[PDB]
Design a protein around this ligand. Structure first.
Ligand code: OJ5
Ligand code: OJ5
Ligand code: 3FX
Lengths: 291, 276
């Protein structure tokens, strides 16, 4: 009766393994004991910038897209904030490359970036900049559907604010105009997508072995990066990356425009991700049999 | 050429492996970095240095496209690793002894017109005997007759001095600010602003008052004052390595013998984890 209303979070959820780091704390697999539903929970201590966390939650709540991780709700556990989210059972593309010790095929990249671009097209229409687009922040569910994750550093455009000027992101992936003092908008995410395309192909971004703070100073001045071995890759993939990595943000393609690029327009269904998913989660299950 | 063993970790800019010199049986560390000129800077600065408080340079080989740099091996690893492995922060007395050796390294570097620019627990090593040595000259800077200051914005954000972050030029005492943050890091387990985004922190350090301990009542007046003297915002006013070697917290520091248990526990937990 009245004993069901004050059940504490560690009584509602069965908390399992750490999945990785998020914006302002760690993320864990969990089961809703009642419904059997599986979820991800980011645990955030009270000494975090709680303004920014409410922003993240807010941006997630406003978004309703099969290409963006859903928000389910929040719980307090002592002073700790539990943020409860959609669980994607294959993990990040970063994890899947690491687990298999293999980069992705042109075909796998094409399909994943098409879903990623549909996410970006939704966000950009809703005047949201992600600002942290990389393989780390693109998730696959067991069915092979990609979802944008980690709105920790995301930015909002409004009637009175057509541009942001906050220098933020992960250096290697950050657009020149983000790094320079001038204001920027949604197409910053397209530059980051370009770097991510290279990251999935080659296993790391350009300048990956250089110091991050030396890279940030070079990106604005340097010509647009390209593949480490251009002759390995199709003309369509090479051109896709070239269209993403245009230095002038005014000239740079939109998510909508890039969805029509031959490399992406021609993309196969999620069925070509079946092997990639199965191998990854197999290597995961084997490594978990060291308990 | 030499017998390559386990990864020991990442540097700022390259992976580092244990190795044995096939000829002499001598044990060494090798940092592997691929090539896209600036790397020569690190090697150059390493060769110019000859100090028991700095990892010595042994030589270089290129293997495929990757340059392998051969360095002094310190068998206890980084202070960062030792705090993590034992899941314990360090006592005032352990910090005192380690930072005294660290300061003698800085005093040598600063006299040689070198700025390290990446001072943190990650980049302070102990050999098996418990002697501390400065590692990772990846982002290190050189002063000359016509260049009394650098202006390159570089380092690890949480640890970086305000004057380094601002466009104004800076000199050796940038390392002393970083040492202050490192003192807090070893005491508390993390730098200040640790639960903030790095790129938000970098913009706050110049404007914010000097960071302090999360729990002031836990720490001696000597340690509190040491950190306060390191974290002076004005680089002109900030103490030098030489001056801080005379600070009561450090001058009164015990021999390396108080590191014996810390070392033994750490390397034991390392050897156990390597059997799984
Ligand atoms: Cl705030 C944040 C940031 C990145 C990813 C997630 C996440 C949500 N649902 C997930 N399912 C599986 N794995 C996830 N990650 C957690 C972060 O490390 C990568 C895996 C997630 C959450
Ligand atoms: Cl470039 C660089 C940066 C930091 C440390 C080393 C290093 C040299 N000799 C070593 N012996 C033992 N452990 C070492 N670790 C410390 C932990 O991180 C990896 C390198 C080292 C090298
Ligand atoms: O899905 S669970 O979190 O386990 C169940 C929720 O805690 C239910 N909380 C409601 C609060 C308002 C009054 C009715 C109950």
């Amino acid at each position: 009766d009245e004993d069901s209303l004050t059940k504490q979070p560690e009584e509602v959820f069965d908390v399992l393994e750490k999945l990785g780091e998020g914006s302002y704390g760690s993320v864990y697999k969990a089961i809703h004991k009642e419904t059997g539903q599986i979820v991800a929970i980011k645990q955030v201590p009270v000494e975090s910038d709680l303004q920014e966390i409410i922003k993240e939650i807010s941006i997630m709540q406003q978004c309703d897209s099969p290409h963006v991780v859903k928000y389910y709700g929040s719980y307090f556990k002592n002073t700790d904030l539990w943020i409860v989210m959609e669980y994607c059972g294959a993990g990040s593309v970063s994890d899947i490359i690491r687990l298999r010790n293999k980069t992705l095929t042109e075909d796998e990249i094409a399909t994943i970036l098409q879903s990623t671009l549909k996410g970006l097209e939704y966000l950009h229409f809703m005047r949201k900049i992600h600002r942290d687009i990389k393989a780390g922040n693109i998730l696959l569910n067991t069915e092979g559907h990609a979802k944008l994750a980690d709105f920790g550093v995301a930015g909002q455009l409004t009637d009175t604010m057509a541009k942001r000027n906050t220098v933020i992101g992960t250096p290697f992936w950050m657009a020149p105009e983000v790094i320079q003092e001038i204001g920027y908008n949604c197409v910053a995410d397209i530059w980051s997508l370009g770097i991510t395309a290279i990251e999935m192909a080659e296993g790391k971004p350009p300048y990956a072995d250089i110091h991050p703070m030396r890279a940030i100073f070079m990106i604005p001045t340097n010509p647009p990066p390209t593949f480490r071995k251009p002759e390995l890759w199709s003309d369509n993939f090479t051109d896709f990356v070239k269209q993403c990595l245009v230095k002038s943000p005014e000239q740079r393609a939109t998510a909508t425009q890039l969805l029509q690029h031959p490399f992406v327009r021609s993309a196969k269904g999620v069925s070509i991700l079946r092997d990639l998913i199965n191998e990854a989660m197999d290597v995961k299950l084997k490594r978990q049999e060291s308990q």
